[PDB]
C-alpha cells in the first residue's frame, strides 16, 4: 500500500522485552571471521601495567639449558680490568 | 529550520542515467520518510517515489516503475534518487520534500517542507 | 495530534462529596489514557493508567471509567488531600496532556 | 523507591545552548526508557522527548523539533536534555519522567514516576 | 541429571539484607539463563528475576523491582539473588529454576527444571 | 500484566475417572502457557509447555490444549499419583502464575 | 582433500564412558567449527554436539545435553568427544562433520565435509 | 525443536525419469535447509545447500527448490548412481534431520 | 613510496610444488595484514589468502583452501606464498596486495596498494 | 559468498563526457565496496574505497555512490588515461570481484 | 612468621627529602614483589608504589610520580622508599605491605601481611 | 582509576547478629577484590582476597561474595572482637581502596 | 614536575632528513609511551606518530608512514623522531607529548603532558 | 578514520558569562574524546579526558559532557585567563584534531 | 592455585576390563598435567606428562586424554599388576595434586 | 622434544628439473632449522643454517626457506651430484633430526 | 652474522651545510656502534664510538645517533678538510664494517 504511513511511530514500546530468549543462540556462525580487521591496533595502551604479577614465577624451567651458545664469545673484553683487588 | 537542498542536477542524454541528492538538516532524519516530487511545465506537480523511514518499503510512481530507484542513508541525512534510463519525459523540476509536518498515524502522505528543487534536462 | 479539553473548568465540593471530572479526546484513543493529580509545589502523581487501573499505592477511593472519547474520573469519597488540579493524557497517538481541571472546596 | 532528580537549570539568555541532568536510582535504569515533561503555566504540561532503553531510538515534540537533543549512559544512570537555540517559547519546569510502572507490552507511554522538576527560563 | 540446590536460606529482620545462592549441575551452565520463583502459601507461585546465559540482561518483578539483584558466575555455576531491603512481603520459599527443557528459538520462558526451594522468613 | 484465573477451584474424582482442569487469561497469550504439577512438599514439575507439547517423561495421560483466552489440562484417567495442585504459567508477555487448582480424592 | 577419520570406537557397558577421537586433515582446521552426528538404524540421523573454532561456544542436543562433552585442540587437528554415562539408547554410528563448505556468515549449520563414521555399542 | 517429514517413504523410478523428492517442516525454516545423499556403507554427501545452492563437484542434474515448510528436491534425468536415501536437514533452529526417502528402481 | 615485488614465478607442471615471495618496503610492514590476490584471464580478479599482522590468523579462499599456505617474516619484511599441489585452474598472474590506505577498525579488507605481479604457468 | 556483476560490459564515451559505471551485489553489502582501475600491463589501482570515499592521490573526477545492492561509479568528465577496466570489489563478507567494465573511445 | 618492620619516620619540613626502610624477615624475600600503603585520616588508606622480585619494575602512584622512588636490596632483605619534595599533603602512616599471601599467577596485587606502620608528619 | 565507594558508613550490630557490609564499584572489577579489616591502632588484616577465597587463619565466620560492581562482606555471627573498620580494595585496574566502614556496639 | 623540552628544530631543504630530540625528566620515563603532536597553521593539530614503553610497537600517521621513524631510548629518558624525505608539506612545530595522565587501563591516547615544540621548516 | 568538526567557530562573550563550545564527530568515537587549551605561544593543555573526568588542577569552572558523536564543553563563569583556542581531540579510532574554537571578548 | 579434583574416589573394574579415571581442575590448566601410579609401600610412578605424552618403559596400555579443564585416564585392557592409586598433578600454576583414586577388584 | 617429519619419503627428479622436499615441526622452532646432504658412504654435509642462509662453499642451487612448523628445501636444477639423502634438523629446542628424503633418477 | 649497508653510498654536498650519513644492520645491535673517517691515503679515525660518545679530540661538528638497527651520522656544518670516506662498524656480534660512504664536493 503506498498510502501506508512511513513515518515511525513514537507510541512503541521502549522498554526491553524480557521475553527475549535468554538462551545462547546454536545457530550463530562457529566459523573464524576473515571479514576481521588484520591490522594492528594504534589504539591499545602504550603504558605499561602494574597489574602484572610482581611475584617471582616457580613455574619456569629450573633444568639448565643445553641450547645456549657453546662457542667461546669473542666480545668479550680483552682489556686487563684495573677494578681487581690490587691486595694481598 | 527543516532546510532541505537538491543537487545532481544537469544535462544528459536520452539513455544515460543521474543521480540526484538530497541533504536534510534541522530535524531527526531517521525518524521520516522522505518522497521525490516532479514538477513540469504545462503537466504541475507529479509525485516520483516515496522512502520508509529506513528505507525498508519503497514506492514508485507508475511513469517512473522499475527506472527510479530511491534510497537513503540515515547516517549522512542524504536522500538519493537514481535515475537509469532517463527520457525526454522526464524533464522537469525535482522536489525533495518531507512528509507531515509533524507524527500523525493517520494523517501522511502530504508534504510539510520543500526544498528549493533542482533542474535534470534530457535532450541531444 | 489529538486535542484534549476537560469540563468543567473548576468543581466545587465539601470534604465527604463525590466529584466527577470529564475527559474528552478531538479523536478515538481506545483505553489508553493516564490521569495524574499535582499538588502546588509538587509533581505529577499517576493515579490511574490505562483506562480504569489504578496504580500501585492509590486507594480505591479513585475511580476511572470510559473509553473512545469519552472518560471520565469519579473521586468516591472526597478527602481533604484530594483537593488539586487533575490532568488527562492519552499515549495511544502522540503524547498529549489536558488542560487541567481543579478541585476546590466548596 | 523510584528517585528522580532534575539539575542544570537557572537563567539563560535567548538563542544560547543549557544542558539538563537527571539522576534516576531504586530501578533497573537500563531496561526502562525514559521522558522528558514540560510544565508551562498558562499552557499546562506539554510532552517534549523520549528515549529508547538503549538509546536506539530517540523522538521530539513538534515545537522542539531540531532544536532539542536527549541521550542517556545506562553506566552512570543518569538522563540528558540538551537545549541548542533556546526561545522565549521554553520558559517552563522540565520534569524527567519514567515511562511506566512495569512492562506491559500492549500499554506503555505514560509516565508512571516523575521528578520534582528543575526551573529553566530563558529572558534578557 | 538437571540437578538444582538453593542454599543461603534462614531467618532475618525487615531492612536487613538475605542472599541465596543456587549451585547447578548436570547442563552446560553457561548456555541457558536462570530464573528465580517465589512461592507464598495463600498468594501462590510469583515470579522474582531472570538472568541472561551470559548475564548480559536482567529483569525484575514489580514487587521486587530496585531491592533485589540477580547475577551470575558461570565459573562455578552458580546463580546468586542479593535481597536488600527486605520486608514482611518477602516471606517465601523461593526456587531456583532454568528456563526451558532445550533450546528453541520462539518458545522460552518456561521453567522445565526446578530446584528443591528454600525457606526465607523475615520477622523480629 | 496479565491477571491468571482458573475454575473450579477444587475438583473431587475418583481415580479411573476423567479430570478437566481449565485456566483462563485477561488477554490473549496465543501458544505460550505452561502447566505445573506440585505435590505436597515437592517443587512442582513441568507437564506441558507451549499449548499441548508435554516434557519428556510425561506420560500420554496428561493432554494440554487450548490456545488464546481459553485453555483446558485433561487427565484421561487419573491414578493415585495424579492427586496435587496443578499451576497455569502465561509466558507470552511477563510471568504469571494462576492461583492454583487441587485435585483430591472422591 | 578434506579428509576426516574417527577412532576410539567399540563396545561398552551401560553407565561407563567412551571416548572417541576424530583426526582432520586437508584444511585449516583453527578456521572452522565442527559437528557430531549419529545415524541410529530405525530413527535415522540426529545432530549430537558442536563446537566453535577456537573451542569457546560448546552446543549439545537435548538427549546428550549433561552427559556428552565435545572438546578440540586446534594443535593436533583433532576433534574429541567424551561420552559419560553411556545409555543402551546412544547405540548408533558416530560421524564427524564439519561445518559448510566455505565461509558464509550467513549460511552456516550445514555438513560440508563428513568422515567415515565409527560404531559404538552399548549392550551387556 | 522442529520436526522434520519426509514424503513418500519410498520413490520408485526407472533410470532416465524424473524423480523429485519432498521435505516438510513443522514451522517455517525460511531458506536454510540442506540434503544429503546416502549410500549403503557410506557417509552422507551434502548435494544441496541453502534452498537451492548446489555444493561443488555435484552435477546439475539434482535441483532443490522451496521456501518457508515445502521443500522438493528434483533429479531432472536419473542415472544408475542416483539409487540411495536422500535425508534433509534444516539448520534456521537448532539441526533436525528428517526420516529419510529411499529411491529404488522399478 | 610503497613498493611491493614479487617473485619465484616461471612454470612448473601439474601436482608439483612452486613458491611465490614478495617484498615490501615504504612502510612499518609488521602493522598490516597482507594479502595474495589472483587474475586469471577470461575470469576476472580473484582473491587467494590473507594473513594478520603477526601472522596470528590466517584465512585461503575456498579454491586454494588445504593446498596453498600464507606466511611472512616481519624481520625480513617479506611475504611467502607456498603453493603446493598445483593444478592447471592455477594458472595466473598472482598479486601482493596490503590491505588498506591506512589504519581504520570499521573499514578493512580492500586492497590500497598492489604489486606488479608475477606469474604462476602450470602445464607440461 | 556474494556474486557481483557490472552491467554494462562495455560503455563507450568520448573524452569529455559523463560515463557511469554500474555494480550489483546478490547480497547486500552495506557501505563496503571498493573500485579498482587497471590498465593494460599494469596492476589494479584503488579508486574508491568504502561506498563513496576516495583514495589520496585520485582526482575528484571520480566519483562514488550507492549502498546496499547497487553501486555506481561516476566519472565527471572523462581524460584521455582513464581509458581501462573497473572491477568491484565487495569486502562485507568474504573478498569477491567483479567481472570488470571496459570503457573505450566512442 | 613474615614480620614487617617500617623504620626511618619522623618529622621533616616540606620541600626535604626522607628516607624510609623496610624490614622482612620470615620468608624468601627475592620470590616477592612488595608495596608501600599511606594512610591519612580523613581519605582513607592510599596505594604509593610497587616494585618487582627483581627491582627491574617500578610503579608509582600519580600523586607520588616523580617524587618517591622505590627501592629494594635482596641481601639484606629491606625496601626502601625515597621521598624527595615532600608536601603538607604528604603526612600519613606509611605501611610496608607484600604483594599476595602465595603466589597464584592469576591472583595478584592484595597485601597479604602488613607492617607495623611509621608516622611522617611534614609541617613547620 | 576506579572509584571505590562502601555504604553504609556505619552499622549498628549486636553481638550474635549477623552483619553485612556493602561495596561498590565505578567500573568492572571482574572477580579481584580484597576485604581488609583494621582495628585502632593496628595495620589491616587481610581477610578476604579475590572475590570470596578467605586468608588462612581467618574463621569462616567471614563471608565474601559478588562480582563486577557488586560487592559485600558477610558476617554470619559477628563476636566481640570483630568490631573494627572494614576497607574495600580493587586490584584489576590500579590500586584504590574504600573508604572505609566501620562496625560498633549496639 | 614532568618538564618536556625538544630540540633539533632548525631549517632544512625539502629532501633531506632531520631528527628531532625530547628530552623528559619528572616522571619514570619507561612506564609511559609518548607521542609526536604536529601543530600546522591553518591546519590545526596533528599526530605523527605513538611508540611503547619498551619500544616494541611503533605507529605513524598515513601522512607519515615510511618516511618518519619514532624511537626511544629508556636509559637516558630521551625521545627521538628521526624525518627523513622531508616535504614542503612537514613545515609545523612538533611536541613532545607524553599518553595519558595516569594509567587507566580503558582510557588511553590522550596526551596530558606537553612540551614546548620546536619548529621545523623545510624551503629552499 | 573519524573526521572532527567544530561549532561555531568562535565565540564572543564577556567575562562572568557561560561560554558552550560544541563538537562533533562523523563516526561514533562512545567515551574517548578529550579537550584541549591552547594559548597563543603555549602548548595545548588537557582540560578534560575521556568524555568528562577534569585533570589535576583544572578548575571545576570547566565542565565536559557529551557521548558519541555530540559533545560540549561547558564554562560555567569564564574568567579573564579563559580566553583561548580550544581543541576537541577523539582516541577511539586513531589520533584526530578539531580545528580549534576560539573564544573572544565581547 | 588450582584445587585439583578426581571422580570417583573408588573403581572396581575385573582383569581385561578397560578402567577410566577422571581429573579435573578448578581452572584452565590446558596441556601441563601429569599422571602417577604408587603401589602401596612403593613411590609414585610416572605415567603420563604433558596431557597424552607417555613416559618411557609405560606400556602402550596406559592412555591418557584430555585439556583445558576436563582430564580422563585411560586403562585399555587392565591386567593385574595394575592395581594402585593414580594420582593427577597439574603443573601449569604452582604444584597441586589430587586426592588419589584407586583401583579395586571386582 | 620436537618430532621431525619428512614428506614424501622419496622424490623422482630428472637432471634439470626442480626439486623440493618438506620438513615439518610438531610445535614451532622459529627459524632455527638446518638442512644436510649425505652421500652413501659419506657423512653428512651442511648445505642450509637458520632457516634459509647458505654454507659457504655451497652452490646457489639449493634455496631453503619456512619458518615455524613448515620448512621447505628447493633445488632450482637439479644436478648429477645432487642425487641424495636429505636431512632436517632442529636445534631451537634439543637436537633432533628428520627420518631423511632420498632422491633418485626418474 | 650482522650485515652492515650504507646507504647512499655517495652523496653531494657544499662546505657549509649539513650532511646526514645511514647505517642500517640486518640484526638488532642495541647501543655498540662505532663510526670510522679514512681520508685518501692513510689509516681511518676513530669519530664515534658506542652511539654517541665522541672519542677525545673530535670537535663537536661530528653527531652520531641511533639504536639498535638504525644508525645515522650527521655533521652540523660540513667543513673543506673533512671530505673523505666514513665507515659503520658493529661490534656486539663479531666485528663486521659497512662498505663505506663518500661525501663530496657539489
Known amino acids: 500500500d503506498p498510502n501506508a504511513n512511513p513515518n515511525v511511530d513514537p507510541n512503541a514500546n521502549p522498554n526491553v522485552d524480557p521475553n527475549a530468549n535468554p538462551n545462547v543462540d546454536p545457530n550463530a556462525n562457529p566459523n573464524a571471521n576473515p571479514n576481521a580487521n588484520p591490522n594492528a591496533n594504534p589504539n591499545a595502551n602504550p603504558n605499561a601495567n602494574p597489574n602484572a604479577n610482581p611475584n617471582a614465577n616457580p613455574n619456569a624451567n629450573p633444568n639448565a639449558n643445553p641450547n645456549a651458545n657453546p662457542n667461546a664469545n669473542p666480545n668479550a673484553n680483552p682489556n686487563a680490568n684495573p677494578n681487581a683487588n690490587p691486595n694481598a | 529550520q527543516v532546510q532541505l537542498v537538491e543537487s545532481g542536477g544537469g544535462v544528459v542524454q536520452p539513455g544515460r542515467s543521474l543521480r540526484l541528492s538530497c541533504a536534510a538538516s534541522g530535524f531527526t532524519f531517521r525518524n521520516f520518510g522522505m518522497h521525490w516530487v516532479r514538477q513540469t511545465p504545462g503537466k504541475g506537480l507529479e509525485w516520483v517515489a516515496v522512502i520508509w523511514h529506513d528505507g525498508s518499503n519503497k514506492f514508485y510512481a507508475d511513469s517512473v516503475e522499475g527506472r527510479f530507484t530511491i534510497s537513503r542513508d540515515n547516517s549522512k541525512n542524504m536522500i538519493y534518487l537514481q535515475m537509469n534510463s532517463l527520457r525526454v519525459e522526464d524533464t522537469a523540476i525535482?522536489?525533495?520534500?518531507?512528509?507531515?509536518?509533524?507524527?500523525?498515524?493517520?494523517?501522511?502522505?502530504?508534504?510539510?517542507?520543500?526544498?528549493?528543487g533542482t533542474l535534470v534536462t534530457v535532450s541531444s | 495530534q489529538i486535542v484534549m479539553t476537560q469540563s468543567p473548568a473548576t468543581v466545587s465540593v465539601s470534604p465527604g462529596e463525590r466529584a466527577t471530572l470529564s475527559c474528552r479526546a478531538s479523536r478515538s484513543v481506545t483505553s489508553k489514557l493516564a490521569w495524574y493529580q499535582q499538588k502546588p509545589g509538587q509533581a505529577p502523581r499517576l493515579?490511574?493508567?490505562?483506562?480504569?487501573?489504578?496504580?500501585t499505592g492509590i486507594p480505591a477511593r479513585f475511580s476511572g471509567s470510559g473509553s473512545g472519547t469519552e472518560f471520565t474520573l469519579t473521586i468516591s469519597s472526597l478527602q481533604s488531600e484530594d483537593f488539586a488540579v487533575?490532568?488527562?493524557?492519552?499515549?495511544?497517538?502522540?503524547?498529549?496532556?489536558?488542560?487541567g481541571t481543579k478541585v476546590d472546596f466548596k | 523507591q523510584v528517585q528522580l532528580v532534575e539539575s542544570g537549570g537557572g537563567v539563560v539568555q535567548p538563542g544560547r545552548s543549557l544542558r539538563l541532568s537527571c539522576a534516576a536510582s531504586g530501578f533497573t535504569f537500563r531496561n526502562f526508557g525514559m521522558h522528558w515533561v514540560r510544565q508551562t503555566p498558562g499552557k499546562g504540561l506539554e510532552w517534549v522527548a523520549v528515549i529508547w532503553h538503549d538509546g536506539s531510538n530517540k523522538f521530539y515534540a513538534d515545537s522542539v523539533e531540531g532544536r532539542f537533543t536527549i541521550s542517556r549512559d545506562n553506566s552512570k544512570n543518569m538522563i540528558y536534555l540538551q537545549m541548542n537555540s533556546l526561545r522565549v517559547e521554553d520558559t517552563a519546569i522540565?520534569?524527567?519522567?519514567?515511562?511506566?510502572?512495569?512492562?506491559?507490552?500492549?500499554?506503555?507511554?505514560?509516565?508512571?514516576?516523575?521528578?520534582?522538576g528543575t526551573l529553566v527560563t530563558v529572558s534578557s | 541429571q538437571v540437578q538444582l540446590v538453593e542454599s543461603g536460606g534462614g531467618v532475618v529482620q525487615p531492612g536487613r539484607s538475605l542472599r541465596l545462592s543456587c549451585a547447578a549441575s548436570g547442563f552446560t551452565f553457561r548456555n541457558f539463563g536462570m530464573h528465580w520463583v517465589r512461592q507464598t502459601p495463600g498468594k501462590g507461585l510469583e515470579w522474582v528475576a531472570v538472568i541472561w546465559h551470559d548475564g548480559s540482561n536482567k529483569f525484575y518483578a514489580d514487587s521486587v523491582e530496585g531491592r533485589f539483584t540477580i547475577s551470575r558466575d558461570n565459573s562455578k555455576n552458580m546463580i546468586y539473588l542479593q535481597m536488600n531491603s527486605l520486608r514482611v512481603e518477602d516471606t517465601a520459599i523461593?526456587?531456583?529454576?532454568?528456563?526451558?527443557?532445550?533450546?528453541?528459538?520462539?518458545?522460552?520462558?518456561?521453567?522445565?527444571?526446578?530446584?528443591?526451594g528454600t525457606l526465607v522468613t523475615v520477622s523480629s | 500484566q496479565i491477571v491468571m484465573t482458573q475454575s473450579p477451584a477444587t475438583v473431587s474424582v475418583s481415580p479411573g475417572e476423567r479430570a478437566t482442569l481449565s485456566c483462563r487469561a485477561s488477554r490473549s497469550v496465543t501458544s505460550k502457557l505452561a502447566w505445573y504439577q506440585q505435590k505436597p512438599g515437592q517443587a512442582p514439575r513441568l507437564?506441558?509447555?507451549?499449548?499441548?507439547?508435554?516434557?519428556t517423561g510425561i506420560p500420554a495421560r496428561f493432554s494440554g490444549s487450548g490456545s488464546g483466552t481459553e485453555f483446558t489440562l485433561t487427565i484421561s484417567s487419573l491414578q493415585s499419583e495424579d492427586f496435587a495442585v496443578?499451576?497455569?504459567?502465561?509466558?507470552?508477555?511477563?510471568?504469571?502464575?494462576?492461583?492454583g487448582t487441587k485435585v483430591d480424592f472422591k | 582433500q578434506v579428509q576426516l577419520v574417527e577412532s576410539g570406537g567399540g563396545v561398552v557397558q551401560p553407565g561407563r564412558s567412551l571416548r572417541l577421537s576424530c583426526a582432520a586433515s586437508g584444511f585449516t582446521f583453527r578456521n572452522f567449527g565442527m559437528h557430531w552426528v549419529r545415524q541410529t538404524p530405525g530413527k535415522g540421523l540426529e545432530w549430537v554436539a558442536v563446537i566453535w573454532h577456537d573451542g569457546s561456544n560448546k552446543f549439545y542436543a537435548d538427549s546428550v545435553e549433561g552427559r556428552f562433552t565435545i572438546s578440540r585442540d586446534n594443535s593436533k587437528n583433532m576433534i574429541y568427544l567424551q561420552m559419560n554415562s553411556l545409555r543402551v539408547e546412544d547405540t548408533a554410528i558416530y560421524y564427524c562433520?564439519?561445518?559448510?563448505?566455505?565461509?558464509?556468515?550467513?549460511?552456516?549449520?550445514?555438513?560440508?565435509?563428513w568422515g567415515q563414521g565409527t560404531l559404538v555399542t552399548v549392550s551387556s | 525443536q522442529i520436526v522434520m517429514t519426509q514424503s513418500p517413504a519410498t520413490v520408485s523410478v526407472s533410470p532416465g525419469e524424473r524423480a523429485t523428492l519432498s521435505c516438510r517442516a513443522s514451522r517455517s525454516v525460511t531458506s536454510k535447509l540442506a540434503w544429503y545423499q546416502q549410500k549403503p556403507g557410506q557417509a552422507p554427501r551434502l548435494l544441496i545447500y541453502?534452498?537451492?545452492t548446489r555444493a561443488t563437484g555435484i552435477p546439475a542434474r539434482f535441483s532443490g527448490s522451496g521456501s518457508g515448510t515445502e521443500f522438493t528436491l528434483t533429479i531432472s534425468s536419473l542415472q544408475s548412481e542416483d539409487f540411495a536415501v536422500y535425508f534433509c536437514?534444516?539448520?534456521?533452529?537448532?539441526?533436525?534431520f528428517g526420516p529419510g526417502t529411499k529411491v529404488d528402481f522399478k | 613510496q610503497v613498493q611491493l615485488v614479487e617473485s619465484g614465478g616461471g612454470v612448473v607442471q601439474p601436482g608439483r610444488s612452486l613458491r611465490l615471495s614478495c617484498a615490501a618496503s615504504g612502510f612499518t610492514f609488521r602493522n598490516f595484514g597482507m594479502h595474495w590476490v589472483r587474475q586469471t584471464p577470461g575470469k576476472g580478479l580473484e582473491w587467494v589468502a590473507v594473513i594478520w599482522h603477526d601472522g596470528s590468523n590466517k584465512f585461503y579462499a575456498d579454491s586454494v583452501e588445504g593446498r596453498f599456505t600464507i606466511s611472512r617474516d616481519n624481520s625480513k619484511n617479506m611475504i611467502y606464498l607456498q603453493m603446493n599441489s598445483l593444478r592447471v585452474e592455477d594458472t595466473a598472474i598472482?598479486?601482493?596486495?596490503?590491505?588498506?590506505?591506512?589504519?581504520?577498525?570499521?573499514?578493512?579488507?580492500?586492497?590500497?596498494?598492489?604489486?606488479?605481479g608475477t606469474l604462476v604457468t602450470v602445464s607440461s | 559468498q556474494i556474486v557481483m556483476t557490472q552491467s554494462p560490459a562495455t560503455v563507450s564515451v568520448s573524452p569529455g563526457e559523463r560515463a557511469t559505471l554500474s555494480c550489483r551485489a546478490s547480497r547486500s553489502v552495506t557501505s563496503k565496496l571498493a573500485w579498482y582501475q587497471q590498465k593494460p600491463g599494469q596492476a589494479p589501482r584503488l579508486?574508491?574505497?568504502?561506498?563513496?570515499?576516495?583514495?589520496t592521490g585520485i582526482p575528484a573526477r571520480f566519483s562514488g555512490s550507492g549502498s546496499g545492492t547497487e553501486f555506481t561509479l561516476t566519472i565527471s568528465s572523462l581524460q584521455s588515461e582513464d581509458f581501462a577496466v573497473?572491477?568491484?570489489?565487495?569486502?562485507?563478507?568474504?573478498?569477491?570481484?567483479?567481472?570488470g567494465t571496459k570503457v573505450d573511445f566512442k | 612468621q613474615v614480620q614487617l618492620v617500617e623504620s626511618g619516620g619522623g618529622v621533616v619540613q616540606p620541600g626535604r627529602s626522607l628516607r624510609l626502610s623496610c624490614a622482612a624477615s620470615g620468608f624468601t624475600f627475592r620470590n616477592f614483589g612488595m608495596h608501600w600503603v599511606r594512610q591519612t585520616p580523613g581519605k582513607g588508606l592510599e596505594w604509593v608504589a610497587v616494585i618487582w622480585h627483581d627491582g627491574s619494575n617500578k610503579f608509582y602512584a600519580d600523586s607520588v610520580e616523580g617524587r618517591f622512588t622505590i627501592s629494594r636490596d635482596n641481601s639484606k632483605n629491606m625496601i626502601y622508599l625515597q621521598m624527595n619534595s615532600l608536601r603538607v599533603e604528604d603526612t600519613a602512616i606509611?605501611?610496608?605491605?607484600?604483594?599476595?599471601?602465595?603466589?597464584?599467577?592469576?591472583?595478584?596485587?592484595?597485601?597479604?601481611?602488613?607492617?607495623?606502620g611509621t608516622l611522617v608528619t611534614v609541617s613547620s | 582509576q576506579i572509584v571505590m565507594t562502601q555504604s553504609p558508613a556505619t552499622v549498628s550490630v549486636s553481638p550474635g547478629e549477623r552483619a553485612t557490609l556493602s561495596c561498590r564499584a565505578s567500573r568492572s572489577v571482574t572477580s579481584k577484590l580484597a576485604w581488609y579489616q583494621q582495628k585502632p591502632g593496628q595495620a589491616p588484616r587481610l581477610?578476604?582476597?579475590?572475590?570470596?577465597?578467605?586468608?588462612t587463619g581467618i574463621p569462616a565466620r567471614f563471608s565474601g561474595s559478588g562480582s563486577g560492581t557488586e560487592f559485600t562482606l558477610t558476617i554470619s555471627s559477628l563476636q566481640s572482637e570483630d568490631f573494627a573498620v572494614?576497607?574495600?580494595?580493587?586490584?584489576?585496574?590500579?590500586?584504590?581502596?574504600?573508604?572505609g566502614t566501620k562496625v560498633d556496639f549496639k | 614536575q614532568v618538564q618536556l623540552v625538544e630540540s633539533g628544530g632548525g631549517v632544512v631543504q625539502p629532501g633531506r632528513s632531520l631528527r628531532l630530540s625530547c628530552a623528559a625528566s619528572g616522571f619514570t620515563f619507561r612506564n609511559f609511551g609518548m607521542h609526536w603532536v604536529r601543530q600546522t597553521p591553518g591546519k590545526g593539530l596533528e599526530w605523527v606518530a605513538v611508540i611503547w614503553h619498551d619500544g616494541s610497537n611503533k605507529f605513524y600517521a598515513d601522512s607519515v608512514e615510511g618516511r618518519f621513524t619514532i624511537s626511544r631510548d629508556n636509559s637516558k629518558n630521551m625521545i627521538y623522531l628521526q624525518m627523513n624525505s622531508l616535504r614542503v608539506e612537514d613545515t609545523a612545530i612538533?611536541?613532545?607529548?607524553?599518553?595519558?595522565?595516569?594509567?587507566?587501563?580503558?582510557?588511553?591516547?590522550?596526551?596530558?603532558?606537553?612540551?614546548?615544540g620546536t619548529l621545523v621548516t623545510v624551503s629552499s | 578514520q573519524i573526521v572532527m568538526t567544530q561549532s561555531p567557530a568562535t565565540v564572543s562573550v564577556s567575562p562572568g558569562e557561560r561560554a558552550t563550545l560544541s563538537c562533533r564527530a562523523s563516526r561514533s568515537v562512545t567515551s574517548k574524546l578529550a579537550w584541549y587549551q591552547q594559548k597563543p605561544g603555549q602548548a595545548p593543555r588537557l582540560?578534560?579526558?575521556?568524555?568528562?573526568?577534569?585533570?589535576t588542577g583544572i578548575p571545576a569552572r570547566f565542565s565536559g559532557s557529551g557521548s558519541g558523536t555530540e559533545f560540549t564543553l561547558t564554562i560555567s563563569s569564564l574568567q579573564s585567563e579563559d580566553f583561548a583556542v580550544?581543541?576537541?581531540?577523539?582516541?577511539?579510532?586513531?589520533?584526530?584534531?578539531?580545528?580549534g574554537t576560539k573564544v573572544d571578548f565581547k | 592455585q588450582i584445587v585439583m579434583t578426581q571422580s570417583p574416589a573408588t573403581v572396581s573394574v575385573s582383569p581385561g576390563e578397560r578402567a577410566t579415571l577422571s581429573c579435573r581442575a578448578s581452572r584452565s590448566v590446558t596441556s601441563k598435567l601429569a599422571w602417577y601410579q604408587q603401589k602401596p609401600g612403593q613411590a609414585p610412578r610416572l605415567?603420563?606428562?604433558?596431557?597424552?605424552?607417555?613416559?618411557t618403559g609405560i606400556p602402550a596400555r596406559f592412555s591418557g586424554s584430555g585439556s583445558g579443564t576436563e582430564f580422563t585416564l585411560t586403562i585399555s585392557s587392565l591386567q593385574s599388576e595394575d592395581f594402585a592409586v593414580?594420582?593427577?598433578?597439574?603443573?601449569?600454576?604452582?604444584?597441586?595434586?589430587?586426592?588419589g583414586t584407586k583401583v579395586d577388584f571386582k | 622434544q620436537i618430532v621431525m617429519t619428512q614428506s614424501p619419503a622419496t622424490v623422482s627428479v630428472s637432471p634439470g628439473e626442480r626439486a623440493t622436499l618438506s620438513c615439518r615441526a610438531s610445535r614451532s622452532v622459529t627459524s632455527k632449522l638446518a638442512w644436510y646432504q649425505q652421500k652413501p658412504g659419506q657423512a653428512p654435509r651442511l648445505?642450509?643454517?637458520?632457516?634459509?642462509?647458505?654454507?659457504t662453499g655451497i652452490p646457489a642451487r639449493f634455496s631453503g626457506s619456512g619458518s615455524g612448523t613448515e620448512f621447505t628445501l628447493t633445488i632450482s636444477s637439479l644436478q648429477s651430484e645432487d642425487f641424495a639423502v636429505?636431512?632436517?634438523?632442529?636445534?631451537?629446542?634439543?637436537?633432533?633430526?628428520?627420518?631423511g628424503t632420498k632422491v633418485d633418477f626418474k | 652474522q650482522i650485515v652492515m649497508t650504507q646507504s647512499p653510498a655517495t652523496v653531494s654536498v657544499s662546505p657549509g651545510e649539513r650532511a646526514t650519513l645511514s647505517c642500517r644492520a640486518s640484526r638488532s645491535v642495541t647501543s655498540k656502534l662505532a663510526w670510522y673517517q679514512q681520508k685518501p691515503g692513510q689509516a681511518p679515525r676513530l669519530?664515534?664510538?658506542?652511539?654517541?660518545?665522541?672519542?677525545t679530540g673530535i670537535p663537536a661538528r661530528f653527531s652520531g645517533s641511533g639504536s639498535g638497527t638504525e644508525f645515522t651520522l650527521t655533521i652540523s656544518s660540513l667543513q673543506s678538510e673533512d671530505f673523505a670516506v666514513?665507515?659503520?662498524?658493529?661490534?656486539?656480534?663479531?666485528?663486521?664494517?659497512?662498505?663505506g660512504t663518500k661525501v663530496d664536493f657539489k
Open positions: 536437514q534444516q539448520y534456521n533452529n537448532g539441526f533436525t
Open positions: 541453502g534452498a537451492s
Open positions: 562433520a564439519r561445518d559448510s563448505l566455505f565461509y558464509d556468515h550467513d549460511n552456516s549449520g550445514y555438513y560440508g565435509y
